[PDB]
Design a protein around this ligand. Structure first.
Ligand code: CHL
Ligand code: CLA
Ligand code: CLA
Ligand code: CLA
Ligand code: CLA
Ligand code: CLA
Ligand code: CLA
Ligand code: CLA
Ligand code: CLA
Ligand SMILES: CC1=C(C/C=C(\C)CCC[C@H](C)CCC[C@H](C)CCCC(C)C)C(=O)c2ccccc2C1=O
Ligand code: SF4
Lengths: 72, 42, 219, 742, 65, 220
């Protein structure tokens, strides 16, 4: 009723946020990185989209490696 | 086509394409598996 | 120099440079300043010439099946008016060797090959003699004027080698063509107002000219 | 002279400007530094007077934009005709247009929304429409889905035609300013050709199609075994048997023997008793006479020849008793400002839309429109809202003229200067009459509430109390009830039956416009209407006149038409702009039109709409409770809002569940708007900067910097959601109520 | 039509009197051979107005009298 | 239904808390206005510059949080009053089947229980709930009048009262009378307060009238 769907949410939702975050890190090092926010690089976004398939291990390791939280 | 793929890369065109595909996906799923309130597949 | 309802602005671009320059442009269609699309003083000349030629074919091919048919010379089956031939299926239909829509596809394809070439000669006149159109592009190249190509195919005879005879023939062409266009307008309006052929209208007006035009909107 | 005056290929057709967004201006064609860039992109999207500062490019842009709008309207018409062709019960409605709900929309059975397909009637499950399109199609004599299908293909053809025309008249061959600035030709053609020949050809359709087919349908004929219109054109014996006036032909016309044409061009006033609409003979005569009128009117202005008038020649030679020395320079501002013309045209188009509503409820022109109460209510409500919106747009564009396109140095007018000079007298007297009207209408309502709550109904303002009778409107009803006997003897019955008499044109078990009485409550609510209109005029005219300068901000035209404020100084200048005045006039147009449509729905449901019995006594929907309950605000809350909103809440069931749902959601969005109107950008920017901190702490910082909405954009979003939610609440309420009761 | 009747007479006279009022009378490019103005546009204008007057008078005569 | 409305309650408490805590911690300053402490608690704004600084004070956060607070207590008290009026009537099943969807709150609580209220004075008589019907409508009227001060802001009103001052100084027999206090429009933060006061007075009076009239029209 709740948990087997709920995990199935947190997976899919965490897919999305792990994709859109990763994309934002991949277009973070551009000259004017705002013209890729409004004009999405479909090749780059398609490369980044399936990175979030197995997102939980990437997020886990990035939490352990400290790459999940910026150090200001 | 050059500069049409840049327009289709723009946020609203890309958002309507993504959400049309996604909405069709959800719509066809609800046709296939209508009236769902549990996940019984385990 | 003969001016038929000329105006102050019509005597600014219709000086003498066209066949039939009687200065009749009261509305002001062919004004050269501020032009574009199909309202151009060259395209309108071309359109006058082409609608006049097609109207001459129409006028001497729409009453011809009735000029003959009421005098013999053809079967009465193939002696219909201009509108009972399948071109107005509400008003009449003849059965040819093909249905009318196959014949329309025929008209469209054959005239497409005949007139898209004419159009690309209007755009760049040097063309239509450079692509292999079965070798008959040798005659389709010589254009000069766009409306008066004058090659081995369209002008086999001279008929206007000198510019005086050619000017007089161009004048005769456009005048007979304007007469034929008015004739086609008469054909359409007469078939609309009477429902019979134009030759029937002529024979009814000539013989006993009673109710010549008094039959307004009555079939 | 009036030449063609176009140029070839001014703008190159390409998708390069599709790629770079916001190309059309200087500060937007750089890229998003923030997220305000996108809102300023969409806001200035059609602000062509801001993109290019010449009337040539502006005029080409608006011309091709009008072509795009026409393509959209033709596409929408194609959609309606097609949904009436393949997804409708139009045949079943033609067979029984009194018990079959007009339905031309079917939903897909996916998530239980299939229950929105209701038992409308005719072996058809679908949504009961309220556009009255079925009534138009019976007024046109359609009687077949093939005809709706082919006119849908034709409207798609015309949509493609208008889209190609916009492309051609911008990108390939566009007019220049000498083509738009000439207006004598534009008026001559839009009068003689658009409106003259348009009415002429519609009268031709009606004379040749609508009258015979509707006479057959009224006589009683299955629409399948009805002769087609082209059979009426061709087979003269048929149309002659319908109307023998056709047997003589046009020699009645050309010999001016029109007296024998009075079999199909009658002046038969009133409504058709068999179907409740107007007499289509009367409507054909109408469109014919209107065609003659506009055809002789479109030969008034001088275009290219010697005869005619110059609009400059009229306006510069119009001396009179009250400031007739003016009117000079109006041809200059109207032929050099699209915003002036847009304001004037929007004012008159919206007022015409309101006239349209008021003349369609009362003189129902289509057959079986008056008894489809959903159609009548929806049409009146719709066109009222459209008229109010268009008038408020007239305000917006009057203001935009006053700020941008107003130069006393070059383009000077005496009348506009005289209006701007004494503008404080204007706004002061209008503020006064607004206060006076608010008091002596709404305070009458409050007096009624207090007296009825204190148990003093003898002291109320009612018919059983202190009477405030509309003597003038009652006198007009008395005259127009007696008009066709003495003043208009050509009419056998009055123009409408709302005046009076023993006339009650029921088509079935339904009323269709008995004479509307005018009591104390009608006086009260008509003065509420005058009140709300005067306050809307106050706000809007005030923004117009003070768009440039005031005693507060004497340099407002340098700040712009659409700016938030000039800071908290001078006490505060928060909504000083003319944009803020149209933004408030929108709320007041909402109040005005909402009380208008409330008056309409309750008055018709209490005094007009109902059932008619076999004894001859009418039982209304609410039951005549407008004269006693619509004098108190508690009655509007109780006998109208609480009572009539039972069908929208005892919905959640059969088809009207969507109207139930769209009730609450509309109730929400209105309230959602209150997040925007009440608040301010500063709080939301600080909340957003905290959330931006939360995003920087996860390497998910966006490059399009999140900014709270602009102040003007917060107000725009607020008034937008407010109008949407309130109007959709009223729409759900109206349609659920009237589809569930009549 | 029916030349010679009242409907023809009081229409012909209206059209011709309006053409006269435009030609030599108070009523008012396109260079015609006419001595003093009265172009084709003015001719059509006077004909239109005379037909207006003619329709008005024939139908005012057909209404009564 | 109790779960769902408890989470609505949690939304109200958390959101009022959000607004208030955000205004308290951004009271001394933020990135948009780091010198806010120098402007005091209640000040209108910081001008249209820097994008726009409407309602940036901590006072404004309070003022928006009073809206969200009244909403929150309206939720808790709607929940209380409907659960209890259904208990007192006897049909707890009504609440249990109708509290889970909002048209149940609009029909079976607001529309249903307000019948005896709005019938406090009808055209053919009145009853003891006439005062509560009148107070109901009064609270509606002032709750709507607060929208004048909240939606409509200053600048329109100062430029209106300028015309009024012109008219008073140029109206005969009223040039005799002249103000001693120059009649300016309401200040900005003041008008947010006045709109909030009308809003809350109307909220409170409306719900008091409805909750007493409905609970006293039948008494369980
Ligand atoms: C692949 C698509 C293709 C299309 C759409 C066209 C279209 C055209 N070619 Mg064409 N061609 C095409 C391939 C080729 N052409 C040519 C060589 C030519 C020549 C030499 C000519 C054309 C002409 C034409 C026109 C006349 C056809 C017509 O009457 O419509 C008929 C349509 C219907 C009957 C549909 C029903 C209505 C038209 C512009 C003629 C022209 O331009 O004038 C002409 O002279 N084409 C070659 C060889 C290089 C092709 C190779 O692929
Ligand atoms: C946030 C609150 C909320 C919640 C929790 C729900 C929950 C639900 N709603 Mg409700 N609903 C809501 C808001 C909500 N809704 C709102 C706001 C509306 C109005 C717009 C509606 C309107 C509405 C309707 C009208 C209907 C529902 C239905 C449903 C059910 C969905 C069944 C379905 O199609 O999913 C099935 C699952 C999916 C679509 C997800 C598929 C995702 C893809 C395929 C990826 C998954 C695989 C992935 C690769 C991972 C695999 C693992 C590994 C191998 C890699 C579910 C109980 C439907 C129902 O059955 O009623 C109970 C229904 O008819 N809702
Ligand atoms: C140009 C033009 C066009 C489009 C047509 C088209 C037509 N003609 Mg016409 N015709 C034309 C010129 C034209 N004609 C000229 C110049 C003459 C001389 C004729 C003399 C003529 C006769 C005598 C007859 C036709 C007939 C026809 C029809 C049959 C054509 C056919 O069988 O092949 C068709 C409607 C026949 C018809 O009526 O069918 C027929 O009997 N035409
Ligand atoms: C596919 C053909 C085509 C192409 C390639 C172009 C290309 C161009 N046009 Mg042209 N144009 C076309 C067709 C075309 N146009 C048509 C058919 C019209 C008539 C409406 C116009 C009218 C027109 C004008 C008036 C102007 C241009 C301009 C431009 C340039 C800017 C384009 C841009 O950024 O806007 C891209 C915008 C869009 C893609 C938005 C499409 C809007 C459509 C028409 C309406 C859709 C509304 C929709 C139904 C309602 C919303 C529903 C939604 C809520 C779900 C560019 C060179 C501008 C220019 O060069 O001036 C500087 C300019 O001012 N065009
Ligand atoms: C104002 C214009 C308008 C509007 C609002 C609609 C709206 C609708 N149409 Mg209609 N339609 C229109 C114009 C319009 N149509 C025109 C111009 C045509 C002719 C091409 C059609 C032909 C058409 C068909 C053939 C069908 C619809 C259907 C529908 C429905 C679902 C469409 C959908 O989800 O598409 C899918 C989404 C995208 C393509 C994106 C919806 C009620 C369907 C329907 O009613 O199902 C019962 C259906 O089968 N429409
Ligand atoms: C008698 C001829 C005539 C007619 C019928 C119209 C009709 C119209 N004009 Mg006007 N116009 C005319 C002459 C005419 N105009 C002249 C002479 C000028 C120059 C002074 C203008 C300048 C002008 C401007 C500047 C604008 C219009 C607009 C409009 C449209 C307003 C929308 C409307 O009412 O929709 C009713 C809709 C219809 C009747 C459907 C239209 C379908 C047909 C095919 C088009 C009408 C005929 C048209 C003139 C094209 C002729 C053929 C073309 C191939 C050359 C309307 C279609 C406005 C508009 O909408 O922009 C597009 C607009 O912005 N016109
Ligand atoms: C003939 C009609 C007409 C025309 C041609 C114009 C044209 C224009 N107006 Mg005017 N206006 C009109 C009617 C019209 N307006 C009406 C009726 C109103 C009253 C509401 C206004 C009020 C108005 C204001 C107050 C302002 C303008 C402005 C403008 C200009 C720019 C608009 C722009 O870029 O927005 C492009 C389009 C949009 C941003 C989309 C708007 C979205 C709407 C509001 C939402 C509603 C849609 C729908 C009903 C809701 C459901 C949606 C669904 C998806 C959920 C342009 C000159 C502006 C201007 O000139 O300022 C310099 C300006 O500030 N107009
Ligand atoms: C119900 C809510 C409400 C009320 C009562 C008002 C009241 C008023 N508005 Mg406001 N307004 C509101 C909501 C409201 N507004 C909202 C929500 C907006 C959003 C945009 C606006 C926007 C707005 C603008 C933009 C304008 C107004 C204007 C007006 C005035 C016009 C009517 C008038 O003075 O007649 C008399 C007063 C009334 C009808 C108000 C009700 C009083 C009743 C009749 C009884 C009074 C009893 C008596 C005095 C005894 C008092 C008790 C005693 C103890 C002292 C008035 C002060 C206009 C204005 O001020 O100029 C004229 C104007 O231009 N309003
Ligand atoms: C001098 C001759 C003459 C006469 C005897 C009449 C007499 C009449 N006219 Mg006519 N009329 C005339 C000239 C005349 N008119 C002219 C010069 C015009 C301008 C074109 C008109 C235009 C005109 C109109 C437009 C109408 C009349 C109508 C009438 C009738 C009623 C007038 C009324 O208001 O009551 C009456 C029989 C009215 C009527 O009802 O006639 C049937 C009507 O509608 N007349
Ligand atoms: C709520 C509110 C905000 C905050 C409103 C926000 C910032 C605007 C809403 C923006 C939306 C939510 C942005 C997200 C849409 C994007 C296109 C992203 C799409 C991707 C997925 C979300 C689908 C203001 O800035 C404001 C300013 C002045 C007066 C009143 C208010 C006000 O009431
Ligand atoms: S509160 Fe907003 S609108 Fe008012 S003065 Fe300050 S910035 Fe300007």
């Amino acid at each position: 009723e709740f948990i087997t769907p709920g995990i199935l949410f947190l997976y899919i939702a965490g897919w999305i946020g792990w994709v859109g975050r990763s994309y934002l890190i991949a277009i973070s090092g551009e000259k004017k990185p705002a013209m890729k926010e409004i004009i999405i690089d479909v090749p780059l976004a398609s490369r980044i989209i399936f990175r979030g398939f197995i997102w939980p291990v990437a997020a886990y390791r990035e939490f352990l490696n400290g790459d999940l939280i910026a150090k200001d | 086509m050059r500069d049409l793929k840049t327009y289709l890369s723009v946020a609203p065109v890309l958002s309507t394409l993504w959400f049309g595909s996604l909405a069709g996906l959800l719509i066809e799923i609800n046709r296939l598996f209508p009236d769902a309130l549990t996940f019984p597949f385990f | 120099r003969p001016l038929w309802f000329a105006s102050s602005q019509s005597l600014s671009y219709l000086d003498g440079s066209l066949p039939g320059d009687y200065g009749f442009d009261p509305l002001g269609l062919s004004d050269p300043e501020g032009t574009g699309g199909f309202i151009e003083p060259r395209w309108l000349a071309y359109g006058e010439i082409i609608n006049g030629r097609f109207a001459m074919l129409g006028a001497a091919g729409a009453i011809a099946p009735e000029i003959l048919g009421k005098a013999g010379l053809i079967p009465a089956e193939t002696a219909l008016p201009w509108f009972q031939t399948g071109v107005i299926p509400p008003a009449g239909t003849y059965t040819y060797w093909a249905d009318n829509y196959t014949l329309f596809v025929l008209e469209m394809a054959l005239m497409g090959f005949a007139e898209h070439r004419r159009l690309q000669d209007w755009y760049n006149p040097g063309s239509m003699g450079k692509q292999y159109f079965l070798g008959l592009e040798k005659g389709l190249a010589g254009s000069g004027n766009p409306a008066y190509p004058g090659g081995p195919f369209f002008n086999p005879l001279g008929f206007g080698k000198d510019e005086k005879s050619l000017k007089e023939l161009k004048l005769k062409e456009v005048k007979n063509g304007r007469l034929a266009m008015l004739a086609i307008l008469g054909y359409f309006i007469q078939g609309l107002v009477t429902g019979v052929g134009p030759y029937q209208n002529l024979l009814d007006h000539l013989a006993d000219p009673v109710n010549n035009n008094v039959l307004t909107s009555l079939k | 002279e009036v030449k063609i005056l176009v140029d070839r290929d001014p703008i190159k057709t390409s998708f390069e400007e599709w790629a770079k967004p916001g190309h059309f201006s200087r500060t937007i064609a750089k890229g998003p530094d923030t997220t305000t860039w996108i809102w300023n992109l969409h806001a200035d999207a059609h602000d062509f007077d801001s993109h290019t500062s010449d009337l040539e490019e502006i005029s080409r842009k608006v011309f091709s934009a009008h072509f795009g709008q026409l393509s959209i309207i033709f596409l929408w018409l194609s959609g309606m005709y097609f949904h009436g062709a393949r997804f409708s019960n139009y045949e079943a409605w033609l067979s029984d247009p009194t018990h079959i709900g007009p339905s031309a929309q079917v939903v897909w059975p996916i998530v239980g929304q299939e229950i929105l397909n209701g038992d409308v009637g005719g072996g058809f499950r679908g949504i009961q429409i309220t556009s009255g399109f079925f009534q138009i199609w019976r007024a046109s004599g359609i009687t077949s889905e093939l005809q709706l299908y082919c006119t849908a293909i034709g409207a798609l053809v015309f949509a493609a035609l208008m889209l190609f025309a916009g492309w051609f008249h911008y990108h390939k061959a566009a007019p220049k300013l000498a083509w738009f600035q000439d207006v004598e030709s534009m008026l001559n053609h839009h009068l003689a050709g658009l409106l003259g020949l348009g009415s002429l050809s519609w009268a031709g359709h009606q004379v040749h199609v609508s009258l015979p087919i509707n006479q057959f349908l009224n006589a009683g004929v299955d629409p399948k075994e009805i002769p087609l219109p082209h059979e009426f054109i061709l087979n003269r014996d048929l149309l002659a048997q319908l109307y023998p006036s056709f047997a003589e032909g046009a020699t009645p016309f050309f010999t001016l023997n029109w007296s024998k044409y009075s079999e199909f061009l009658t002046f038969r006033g009133g409504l058709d008793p068999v179907t409740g609409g107007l007499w289509l003979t009367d409507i054909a005569h109408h469109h014919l006479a209107i065609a003659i009128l506009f055809l002789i009117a479109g030969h008034m202005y001088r275009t290219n020849w010697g005869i005619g008038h110059g609009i400059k020649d009229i306006l510069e030679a119009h001396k009179g008793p009250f400031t007739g020395q003016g009117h000079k320079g109006l041809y200059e501002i109207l032929t050099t400002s699209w915003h002036a013309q847009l304001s004037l045209n929007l004012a008159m188009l919206g007022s015409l839309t309101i006239i349209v509503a008021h003349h369609m409820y009362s003189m129902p022109p289509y057959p079986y429109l008056a008894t489809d109460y959903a159609t009548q209510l929806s049409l009146f409500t719709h066109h009222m809202w459209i008229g109010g919106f268009l008038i408020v747009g007239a305000a917006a564009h009057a203001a935009i003229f006053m700020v941008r396109d107003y130069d006393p140095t070059n383009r000077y007018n005496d009348l506009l200067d005289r209006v701007l000079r004494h503008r404080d007298a204007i706004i002061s007297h209008l503020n006064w009459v607004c206060i006076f009207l608010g008091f002596h209408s709404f305070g009458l309502y409050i007096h009624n509430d207090t007296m009825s709550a204190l148990g003093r109904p003898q002291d109320m303002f009612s018919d059983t109390a202190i009477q405030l009778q509309p003597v003038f409107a009652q006198w007009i009803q008395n005259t127009h009830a007696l008009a066709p006997g003495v003043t208009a003897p050509g009419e056998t019955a009055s123009t409408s039956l709302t005046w009076g008499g023993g006339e009650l044109v029921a088509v079935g078990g339904k009323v269709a416009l008995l004479p509307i009485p005018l009591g104390t409550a009608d006086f009260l609510v008509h003065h509420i209407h005058a009140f709300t209109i005067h306050v809307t005029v106050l706000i809007l005219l005030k923004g117009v006149l003070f768009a440039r300068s005031s005693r507060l901000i004497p340099d407002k035209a340098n700040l712009g038409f659409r700016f938030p404020c000039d800071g908290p100084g001078r006490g505060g200048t928060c909504q000083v702009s003319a944009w803020d005045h149209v933004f408030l006039g929108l709320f007041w147009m909402y109040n005005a039109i909402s009380v208008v449509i409330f008056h309409f729905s309750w008055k018709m449901q209490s005094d007009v709409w109902g059932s008619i019995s076999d004894q001859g006594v009418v039982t209304h929907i609410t039951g005549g409770n407008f004269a006693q309950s619509s004098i108190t605000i508690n009655g509007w809350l109780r006998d109208f809002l609480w009572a009539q909103a039972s069908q929208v809440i005892q919905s959640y069931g059969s088809s009207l569940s969507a109207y139930g749902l769209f009730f609450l959601g509309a109730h929400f969005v209105w309230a959602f708007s209150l997040m925007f109107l009440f608040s301010g950008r500063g709080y939301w920017q600080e909340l957003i900067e905290s959330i931006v901190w939360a995003h920087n702490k996860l390497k998910v910082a966006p490059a399009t910097q999140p900014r709270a909405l602009s102040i003007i954009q917060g107000r725009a979003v607020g008034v937008t959601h407010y109008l949407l939610g309130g109007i959709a609440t009223t729409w759900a309420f109206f349609l659920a109520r009237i589809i569930a009761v009549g | 039509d029916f030349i010679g009747s009242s409907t023809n007479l009081i229409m012909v006279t209206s059209t011709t009197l309006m053409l006269f009022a435009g030609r030599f009378g108070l009523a008012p490019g396109l260079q015609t051979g006419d001595p003093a103005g009265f172009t084709l546009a003015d001719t059509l204008a006077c004909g239109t107005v005379g037909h207006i007057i003619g329709v008005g008078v024939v139908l005012g005569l057909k209404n009564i009298g | 239904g109790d779960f769902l409305v408890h989470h609505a309650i949690a939304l109200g408490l958390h959101t009022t808390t959000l607004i208030l805590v955000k205004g308290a911690l951004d009271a001394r300053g933020s990135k948009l206005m780091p010198d806010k402490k120098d402007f005091g608690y209640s000040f209108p704004c910081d001008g249209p510059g820097r994008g726009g600084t409407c309602d940036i004070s901590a006072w404004d956060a309070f003022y928006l949080a009073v809206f969200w607070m009244l909403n929150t207590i309206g939720w808790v008290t709607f929940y209380w009053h409907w659960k209890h009026i259904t208990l007192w009537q006897g049909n707890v099943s009504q609440f249990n089947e109708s509290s889970t969807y909002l048209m149940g709150w609009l029909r079976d609580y607001l529309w249903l229980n307000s019948s005896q209220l709005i019938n406090g004075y009808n055209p053919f008589g009145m009853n003891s709930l006439s005062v509560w019907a009148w107070m109901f409508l009064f609270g509606h009227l002032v709750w709507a009048t607060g929208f004048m001060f909240l939606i409509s802001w200053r600048g329109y009103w100062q430029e209106l009262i300028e015309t009024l001052a012109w008219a008073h100084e140029r109206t005969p027999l009223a040039n005799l009378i002249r103000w001693k206090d120059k009649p300016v429009a309401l200040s900005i933060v003041q008008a947010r307060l006045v709109g909030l006061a009308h809003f809350s007075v109307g909220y409170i009076f409306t719900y008091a009238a409805f909750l007493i009239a409905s609970t006293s029209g039948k008494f369980g």
